[PDB]
Amino acid sequence: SVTVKRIIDNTVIVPKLPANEDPVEYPADYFRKSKEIPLYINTTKSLSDLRGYVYQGLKSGNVSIIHVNSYLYGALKDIRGKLDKDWSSFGINIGKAGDTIGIFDLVSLKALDGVLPDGVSDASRTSADDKWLPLYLLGLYRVGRTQMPEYRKKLMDGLTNQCKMINEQFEPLVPEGRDIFDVWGNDSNYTKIVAAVDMFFHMFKKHECASFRYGTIVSRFKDCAALATFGHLCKITGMSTEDVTTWILNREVADEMVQMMLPGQEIDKADSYMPYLIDFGLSSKSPYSSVKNPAFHFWGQLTALLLRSTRARNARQPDDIEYTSLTTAGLLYAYAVGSSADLAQQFCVGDNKYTPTNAPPQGRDVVEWLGWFEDQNRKPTPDMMQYAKRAVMSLQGLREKTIGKYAKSEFDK
Amino acid sequence: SVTVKRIIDNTVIVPKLPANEDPVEYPADYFRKSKEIPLYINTTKSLSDLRGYVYQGLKSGNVSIIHVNSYLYGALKDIRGKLDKDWSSFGINIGKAGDTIGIFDLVSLKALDGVLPDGVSDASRTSADDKWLPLYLLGLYRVGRTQMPEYRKKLMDGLTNQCKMINEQFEPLVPEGRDIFDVWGNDSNYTKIVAAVDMFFHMFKKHECASFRYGTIVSRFKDCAALATFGHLCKITGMSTEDVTTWILNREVADEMVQMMLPGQEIDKADSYMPYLIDFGLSSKSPYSSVKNPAFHFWGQLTALLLRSTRARNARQPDDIEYTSLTTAGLLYAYAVGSSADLAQQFCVGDNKYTPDTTNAPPQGRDVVEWLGWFEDQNRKPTPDMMQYAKRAVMSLQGLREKTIGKYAKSEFDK
Amino acid sequence: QPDDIEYTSLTTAGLLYAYAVGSSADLAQQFCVGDNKYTPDLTTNAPP
């Protein structure tokens, strides 16, 4: 199939079609360039001054992102952090035993000359400061990413969070639309901060200030959907990481599973830069995204769903994947796990159970099952088709273009 | 299965996936560090003065937690407590026979210099004091933790409670939202207090003031769900603690059952610090939680439900557990207990039943091996009578909250 | 739906193509551990 001809006038035709590009970009395969993450917090002026520019600046449809950055740098050199271990990652060292280190031991620089207000922007504000204002400012990053009345949910809750210890209310004005402070996300030097906070308070999960993650947490494994719908597919079938891998039954799902598992990227690692590959700007196109792993994502999620997953009810159905193979493959995998439970005595009292056509295989072996499928004309049986029905009927509240909505339409009737 | 290869280009792939951490922390395995629970009630000023700062401070959308702490220390050195026994725990002694001791014989310290009002914050308040104000303040901790119109339920009731003996009425203003005085929970030195009160009035269940537990009680076994969904699974099947254990049929349920039963942690103990492991800050991650025991929790609860449990109707379905094995295992265990009742004559008059007198007929009593084997028999796959059993148990259920094991079971079995 | 095309042949041709892809999935073991399914092991009017 690498040469086609019109069987009427026997001429050559060359089936080609528009190229698609943007390759992925792995973390590690970039610390081969630079060896530091450059945080440009220009303008280093005055803390009390800064506390003002924003306290007020917030109360009004306008505050320079470049101000909030410097303010944050301000409150956050709570060096507070005793590295009771070691800490490297990709070559970069960060501290040794006992060593003390702060949030910004991840490489500070400075730059350009534009600044808006000067000195005292209303001296009003006291050092009710490193207590709650940094949190707010970070918290907003979380609310920035959102879409639906989860915004006013994400906020309403993410506002009773500063009330804690410090009981003091609200601030901006215009609800949202993905507009007001929703720009902050697009600020390279800002993300770079939320990522350092999160990554810091991941290491010192305990620290008094570690509550600062409230809106900084949706940065860890940002754009790493598939990579996480995988640890999910594992947890939900009890199967080993290695066994699950073998249950992959479609080329371009393998392709993508490969892509994600590329060695030397610190993914399995404790505390590493890998999770924030996106917000420290190590990668402009994540290789763990659900958009670069459509087949994987769809398959894993569909499967998890048939297996009674709550989460997966609402995963999105990617476009331009091969549906009636991903599904057929998900049905099998699910029906296997589903019909033959684990089951095996665990504790006892000297007395314990010595375990020992077209009847479907014993355990959860891919080859046993695959072969048994070959058997069934490589075409879904009625009990296994019935299985799918019980799993998806009685589902309710189904968003559209979800793998949840997909499954009910495919199996409930 | 510890080495995988692409069968097309015969290359190695190394299935790995993101690490998850936060280990648990057992109580005992910490009194290997410190040997006292440090209650920092700083600011030791004046009782009459304090009674004021808060009486008023409450009326108004603001009161320093650091005040209420000292106030409570204030009213509560009713030493009242004659230890008619002994009392140790984890090495720490607390008293001997006859010995007298107060709520705070659990280690008071002091500290930092920030204080808000000075002296007389309206001398108005009389010693209508160690009678009801401490209760309120504590009672609020309970209302703090809540989520739904159970708040205004928890309060409305937890307000006719001071009306006892004392008898008049309300104080703050703004309903809730998890905000007003809902911060108090996050105050290390505050929790440390509710825990001492509860633990004290657990020991002297009788004491005149022991009514102070009204909102201090949701501290005992806080974050110990699974550990308690287990004594439930026992009570509800009549089975022994040891027998129930054997009926565990999934690896990671055993795993967790182990985790929970780790020896030398005073869990089976009378009055111990173990229950308050969380609020005295002995542990930052409970090993008895339903979040660290998801499989156990789901299995035990699902089972209890099939067994006609009222409580379990509303337990929450954890995420990322292996559902169609936990369930299959729960169905069996339940069907076993369910179909073969205990039943056995107990009393008589010289005349009593000597109990003794085929295929795919399911086993006699409640033996794991007898049943397990009989399951092997049935193609290791749920029969129709046992599947019918599940249906009768879950149909006719109503008022089902979403994401509960109650809602789960009806959807899995009712149809 | 464009106009002035031959519908009951385009459709018939689309049905076939789709039914083919549809009924016979790809499916083929991808990863393993030394143990892997050697694929080889109906009659009339059984579709290809």
Side-chain angles (χ1 to χ4, degrees):
Chain A
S1 304
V2 211
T3 179
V4 191
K5 48 165 192 162
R6 182 88 159 276
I7 92 184
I8 214 57
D9 66 16
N10 211 294
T11 40
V12 224
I13 195 172
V14 192
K16 39 185 169 292
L17 83 186
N20 251 31
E21 214 67 275
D22 64 5
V24 276
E25 295 175 15
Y26 296 77
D29 279 29
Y30 136 116
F31 278 100
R32 193 173 293 105
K33 297 181 176 193
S34 161
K35 223 91 198 294
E36 64 178 8
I37 65 107
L39 207 207
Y40 306 134
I41 299 208
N42 311 325
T43 322
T44 319
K45 299 335 161 201
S46 182
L47 181 43
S48 296
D49 273 32
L50 288 161
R51 177 184 308 136
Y53 294 136
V54 288
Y55 179 98
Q56 245 83 64
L58 269 172
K59 308 159 52 211
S60 74
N62 48 41
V63 60
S64 173
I65 178 62
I66 314 86
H67 271 95
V68 25
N69 291 218
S70 310
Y71 172 22
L72 284 166
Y73 191 122
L76 309 163
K77 297 105 58 182
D78 74 313
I79 267 69
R80 309 165 209 171
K82 282 76 185 171
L83 234 179
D84 59 286
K85 271 183 161 291
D86 256 337
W87 206 351
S88 288
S89 177
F90 294 108
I92 282 64
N93 310 317
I94 310 169
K96 235 134 285 70
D99 235 305
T100 253
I101 38 167
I103 295 191
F104 290 99
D105 290 305
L106 313 75
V107 201
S108 178
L109 307 194
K110 182 160 175 177
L112 326 188
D113 303 322
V115 296
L116 359 178
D118 34 299
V120 172
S121 198
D122 236 298
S124 50
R125 254 300 143 288
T126 188
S127 187
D129 180 5
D130 184 50
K131 310 301 126 50
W132 76 287
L133 220 285
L135 188 170
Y136 198 75
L137 284 169
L138 299 148
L140 281 160
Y141 172 45
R142 188 163 172 180
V143 198
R145 280 194 61 238
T146 202
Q147 251 299 66
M148 321 268 166
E150 183 200 45
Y151 23 64
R152 248 69 234 169
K153 170 89 71 72
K154 235 92 177 176
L155 218 170
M156 189 198 61
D157 301 343
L159 96 75
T160 58
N161 248 266
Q162 310 67 29
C163 275
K164 170 182 299 63
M165 304 198 174
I166 4 245
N167 56 287
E168 20 229 15
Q169 236 213 167
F170 183 62
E171 215 132 329
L173 4 85
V174 31
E176 195 179 347
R178 282 175 164 175
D179 148 48
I180 334 85
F181 45 97
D182 308 43
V183 198
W184 294 359
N186 250 122
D187 193 278
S188 164
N189 288 319
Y190 175 66
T191 67
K192 250 137 177 169
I193 295 175
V194 323
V197 180
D198 202 61
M199 170 173 184
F200 184 85
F201 292 140
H202 183 97
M203 176 62 89
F204 311 100
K205 297 175 191 160
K206 276 214 157 58
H207 191 282
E208 37 142 344
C209 277
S211 42
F212 276 143
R213 296 218 304 148
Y214 173 100
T216 220
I217 198 180
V218 306
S219 175
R220 188 184 238 286
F221 293 109
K222 184 191 174 193
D223 292 24
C224 293
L227 204 255
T229 91
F230 169 67
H232 174 61
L233 180 67
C234 295
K235 272 290 165 64
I236 207 196
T237 66
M239 295 194 27
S240 101
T241 151
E242 12 273 350
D243 301 312
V244 170
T245 317
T246 66
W247 264 101
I248 298 202
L249 304 174
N250 308 86
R251 230 292 283 208
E252 51 297 85
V253 175
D255 273 346
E256 302 161 15
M257 174 62 180
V258 181
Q259 182 188 246
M260 297 189 282
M261 298 289 79
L262 192 60
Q265 304 286 149
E266 312 237 352
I267 91 194
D268 73 302
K269 215 266 192 195
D271 307 61
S272 157
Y273 293 117
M274 181 276 160
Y276 313 101
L277 80 155
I278 284 273
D279 274 352
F280 282 145
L282 321 195
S283 184
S284 50
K285 188 84 185 173
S286 179
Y288 315 93
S289 54
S290 105
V291 314
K292 264 297 177 172
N293 304 289
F296 182 87
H297 192 73
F298 174 93
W299 167 86
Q301 219 73 30
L302 172 63
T303 295
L305 176 72
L306 283 323
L307 266 15
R308 281 63 198 236
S309 184
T310 20
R311 168 193 306 175
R313 205 186 72 163
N314 296 323
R316 76 301 331 165
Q317 156 168 340
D319 298 310
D320 297 10
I321 64 191
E322 185 178 350
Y323 302 112
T324 358
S325 296
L326 268 348
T327 51
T328 291
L331 221 205
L332 195 59
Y333 187 9
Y335 178 68
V337 182
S339 69
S340 66
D342 315 297
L343 265 292
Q345 182 169 338
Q346 303 281 142
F347 306 95
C348 65
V349 203
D351 141 20
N352 60 113
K353 188 233 171 48
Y354 292 163
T355 139
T357 208
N358 290 358
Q362 308 148 8
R364 300 167 173 194
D365 189 69
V366 198
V367 202
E368 279 202 338
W369 277 96
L370 248 168
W372 176 85
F373 199 72
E374 274 279 358
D375 237 39
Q376 250 59 22
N377 289 148
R378 299 200 327 93
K379 196 186 282 199
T381 77
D383 172 63
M384 88 184 204
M385 199 82 77
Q386 204 53 220
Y387 189 63
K389 190 182 193 166
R390 290 197 304 90
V392 297
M393 65 172 46
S394 72
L395 267 180
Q396 239 121 79
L398 287 193
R399 298 165 196 173
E400 206 172 26
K401 231 251 302 173
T402 48
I403 61 79
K405 173 142 242 44
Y406 173 98
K408 190 169 177 203
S409 291
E410 185 83 347
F411 297 122
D412 186 8
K413 59 205 174 190
Chain B
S1 303
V2 211
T3 175
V4 190
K5 49 166 191 159
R6 182 87 160 277
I7 94 185
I8 214 57
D9 67 12
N10 212 293
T11 39
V12 224
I13 195 174
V14 192
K16 38 182 173 295
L17 85 187
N20 250 29
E21 214 66 277
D22 64 6
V24 275
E25 294 170 15
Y26 298 75
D29 280 29
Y30 136 117
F31 278 100
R32 193 173 292 105
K33 299 182 176 192
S34 162
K35 224 90 201 293
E36 64 179 8
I37 63 109
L39 209 206
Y40 309 130
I41 297 210
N42 311 326
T43 321
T44 318
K45 299 335 159 201
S46 187
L47 182 44
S48 296
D49 271 35
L50 290 159
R51 176 183 306 136
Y53 295 136
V54 288
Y55 180 95
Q56 245 83 63
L58 268 173
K59 311 159 44 211
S60 95
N62 52 37
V63 60
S64 173
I65 176 65
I66 315 84
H67 271 95
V68 23
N69 291 222
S70 307
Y71 172 21
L72 286 167
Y73 192 122
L76 310 164
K77 298 106 56 182
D78 73 315
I79 265 70
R80 312 164 208 172
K82 280 77 185 170
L83 234 179
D84 57 287
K85 272 182 163 292
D86 255 337
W87 207 350
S88 287
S89 179
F90 293 108
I92 282 65
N93 311 317
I94 311 172
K96 236 135 282 71
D99 235 305
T100 252
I101 36 168
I103 293 190
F104 290 99
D105 291 306
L106 314 75
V107 201
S108 178
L109 307 192
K110 180 160 178 175
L112 325 188
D113 303 325
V115 296
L116 359 179
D118 35 297
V120 173
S121 198
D122 236 298
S124 52
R125 254 300 144 289
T126 188
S127 187
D129 180 6
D130 182 52
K131 312 297 125 52
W132 76 286
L133 219 282
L135 189 170
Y136 200 73
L137 284 168
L138 296 149
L140 281 163
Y141 172 47
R142 188 164 173 182
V143 198
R145 281 194 60 241
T146 202
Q147 251 300 67
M148 321 264 166
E150 185 200 44
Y151 24 66
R152 248 69 233 168
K153 169 88 72 72
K154 236 92 174 174
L155 220 168
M156 188 199 61
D157 301 342
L159 96 75
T160 55
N161 247 265
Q162 309 66 30
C163 271
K164 192 172 286 60
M165 300 303 180
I166 315 131
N167 185 289
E168 11 186 10
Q169 276 262 162
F170 175 72
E171 214 134 330
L173 3 84
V174 31
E176 196 179 346
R178 281 177 164 175
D179 147 50
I180 331 88
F181 45 95
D182 307 42
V183 197
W184 294 358
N186 250 120
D187 193 282
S188 163
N189 286 323
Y190 176 66
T191 69
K192 248 138 178 169
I193 296 176
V194 321
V197 178
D198 203 58
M199 173 171 177
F200 182 87
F201 291 140
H202 183 97
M203 175 64 86
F204 311 98
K205 297 176 190 157
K206 279 214 154 57
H207 191 282
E208 36 142 345
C209 278
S211 43
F212 275 144
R213 296 220 300 149
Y214 173 99
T216 220
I217 198 180
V218 308
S219 174
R220 187 183 238 286
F221 293 109
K222 186 189 174 195
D223 289 27
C224 293
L227 201 256
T229 93
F230 168 69
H232 177 59
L233 183 66
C234 291
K235 274 288 165 64
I236 208 194
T237 64
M239 298 196 20
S240 99
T241 150
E242 13 275 348
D243 298 313
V244 169
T245 316
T246 65
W247 261 103
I248 298 200
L249 304 176
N250 308 86
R251 231 292 284 208
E252 49 299 86
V253 174
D255 273 348
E256 302 159 15
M257 173 60 180
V258 182
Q259 183 188 243
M260 296 187 286
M261 296 291 76
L262 191 60
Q265 306 285 146
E266 312 239 351
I267 90 196
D268 73 303
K269 217 268 193 191
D271 306 56
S272 158
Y273 294 116
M274 181 273 162
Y276 313 99
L277 78 155
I278 284 271
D279 279 349
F280 283 144
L282 319 196
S283 183
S284 52
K285 189 83 186 171
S286 176
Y288 314 95
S289 56
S290 106
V291 312
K292 262 299 172 172
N293 305 285
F296 180 91
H297 192 73
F298 173 94
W299 168 87
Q301 221 71 32
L302 172 64
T303 299
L305 176 72
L306 278 326
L307 266 15
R308 280 66 198 235
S309 184
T310 17
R311 170 194 305 173
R313 204 185 75 162
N314 295 324
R316 73 300 331 164
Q317 158 166 340
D319 300 310
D320 299 11
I321 64 194
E322 183 177 352
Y323 302 113
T324 358
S325 295
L326 271 347
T327 50
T328 291
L331 220 206
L332 193 60
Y333 186 8
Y335 178 66
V337 182
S339 71
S340 65
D342 319 289
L343 272 286
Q345 182 167 339
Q346 304 279 143
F347 306 97
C348 68
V349 203
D351 140 20
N352 60 112
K353 189 234 171 48
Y354 293 161
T355 140
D357 28 271
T358 165
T359 209
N360 290 356
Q364 307 148 8
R366 298 170 175 189
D367 190 69
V368 197
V369 202
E370 278 204 336
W371 276 97
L372 247 171
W374 176 83
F375 200 72
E376 273 280 357
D377 236 41
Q378 252 58 22
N379 290 147
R380 300 200 326 93
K381 195 188 282 196
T383 75
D385 171 62
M386 85 185 210
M387 198 81 75
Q388 203 53 223
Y389 189 63
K391 191 184 194 165
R392 287 196 306 90
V394 297
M395 63 176 43
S396 73
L397 266 180
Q398 240 120 80
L400 289 194
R401 300 167 192 171
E402 206 172 25
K403 233 250 303 173
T404 48
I405 60 78
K407 175 143 242 44
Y408 173 98
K410 189 170 180 203
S411 290
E412 186 82 345
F413 297 120
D414 187 6
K415 56 205 179 188
Chain C
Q1 157 166 340
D3 300 310
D4 297 10
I5 64 192
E6 185 177 350
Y7 304 112
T8 356
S9 294
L10 270 349
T11 50
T12 290
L15 219 209
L16 193 58
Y17 189 7
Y19 177 68
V21 182
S23 70
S24 65
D26 319 289
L27 271 285
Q29 183 168 337
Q30 304 281 147
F31 307 98
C32 66
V33 204
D35 139 23
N36 61 113
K37 189 234 171 46
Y38 293 162
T39 140
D41 29 271
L42 210 158
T43 173
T44 209
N45 291 355

